[PDB]
Symmetry: C3
């Protein structure tokens, strides 16, 4: 069963601020379940657009309709894929869960564009919930999905606003966090001062990605992540 | 079965600040479950007192003792009724849930009074839990919920008061109404603080907003329960 | 079954700031479940170190594997024991749950020390969970990861706030007294004790009023025997 939801939020600020905030959105007080975020790949493609894949870990609980052994708190992984076009001031993002996909797959697409008439950045989100099994509890799944969607809409807008206002996070592998911080800082400067302006972090990136990959080898999620990295969600 | 709880909090500030904060208390980082707040009716009565009814939506979970089909995350609607007397610096407020009432009804009365002698505003709260073999469990649940609510109320109000004193908005349940709501609320807030509370005294903004909300409410399952509740006289 | 976890966090600030923040860490937006914190005992010992025992109450839920009547939201009590050596810029802390210990006991030790090479305060934490093995493991790992995050975010929040809304007593009738005591203590702690200038504050009147109130409330609480028992223990 497939359930679709959609939302629009308008940020009263420039595209550059919104996109930077996206890359720095966690941690914030409105997203308590997020535990870590790592950058898996990043490059500027030949067309001049930034392509990034990130991996998030969160705590959470499966719905009450699942088998009892699967109930309770656990950690889940999310892939996040994005493209930024600095010349057109556009961004597209996609997320999906990497685990529990037979029970529930939740995919979210968001596009960001600038409304010059109102000097604001428009974020249009579409979410697809794909539920595996029970039709007998259709209404319940529906209710659940709506509730999840509504919570996510709020968390997204509050968290982004928080970060935007602040501008004016851990690796899943603690031994990589310091390296991540060093890379992220380098990237943030380059992103704001060079890339978005149409105008450098190789050592920091190398150290960090080597650390993350060594950690990922030992993680059960790696095959699922590799598989998802094969997908082309924007195609 | 009826369980009663009471609490008092003293805000070390003036009535105007506390009352304004009440109308703008959400969102705040201490109340993650609140999803929207709408103004259903508002007027100054012939005695000069402000009468307001609002409608809140929250996410939440029913207690573990309910039927398995009812367990899990859901959304609930809350009615909020208030009277403000600016001459006497008093406010009274009442909330109750509109749905799930067969399982649990939770009613809260709060009075706010300015004590000029101690330069403080006293908030006295009373909560009545009316529950439809597991008495001790219901008691524990009610105590815990109450203690959580006391904390969230004082922390959230303090957060908002501090923001207003040193001088990110709430959603409508109907996203197509949120922008209209923001415009109405802005107008009201200015009138409330600068004119009403000072004894010196938004129709277009109100009209557009309320027309939007009512059109959305027609389509909501909660409308009959809301109408019923609006007939009640909690004070 | 015993499950062990460990973590390290480095705060880019001085020992005094980190230690003060520890005693004022709640409330903060990253720890929604904490409902109250009370000081049960405090003294400067003959060696010049601050010995404190505190009692925290939090809301929470037992794991899904417990009997159905025990499921659902509840309140739980935590003991927190600490020692501060201002001369050496060291602090050690210990927490454990006082109730439900037959189901799950969670003990955490944290040490704070100053790394002069990096001008930072190092916090080393070790957690022991004493308890469907895989499910318990998943639960413990998840709880640990959540707690590591809440601790670092909450501490950073409070440190930043003081560099640039108070906690409740479990007994509401004692909160005002607690605030008066805590304020006095805080001022002394930062201005005198951490600077090696005093082993005795002027907070005795505030302490007396507050502790008398708390103890009167504690007599009526089911947790008192468990608290007394835990206070007999010597975690360090």
């Amino acid at each position: 069963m497939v359930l679709l939801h959609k939302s629009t939020h308008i940020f009263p600020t420039d595209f550059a601020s919104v996109s930077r905030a996206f890359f720095n959105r966690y941690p914030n007080p409105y997203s308590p379940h997020v535990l870590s975020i790592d950058t898996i790949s990043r490059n500027v493609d030949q067309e001049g657009n930034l392509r990034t894949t990130r991996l998030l870990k969160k705590s959470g609980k499966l719905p009450t309709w699942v088998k009892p052994f699967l109930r309770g708190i656990t950690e889940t992984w999310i892939i996040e894929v994005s493209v930024v076009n600095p010349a057109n001031s556009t961004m597209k993002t996609y997320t999906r869960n990497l685990d529990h996909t037979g029970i529930m797959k939740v995919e979210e697409y968001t596009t960001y564009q600038f409304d010059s008439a109102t000097s604001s950045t428009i974020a249009d989100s579409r979410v697809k919930f794909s539920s595996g099994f029970n039709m007998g509890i259709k209404s319940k799944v529906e209710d659940w999905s709506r509730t999840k969607f509504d919570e996510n809409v709020k968390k997204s807008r509050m968290g982004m606003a928080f970060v935007i206002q602040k501008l004016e996070s851990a690796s899943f592998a603690p031994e990589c966090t310091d390296l991540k911080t060093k890379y992220d800082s380098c990237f943030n400067e380059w992103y704001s001062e060079k890339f978005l302006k149409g105008k450098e972090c190789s050592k920091q990136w190398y150290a960090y990605t080597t650390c993350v990959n060594a950690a990922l080898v030992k993680q059960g999620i790696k095959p699922a992540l590799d598989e998802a990295r094969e997908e082309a969600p924007f195609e």
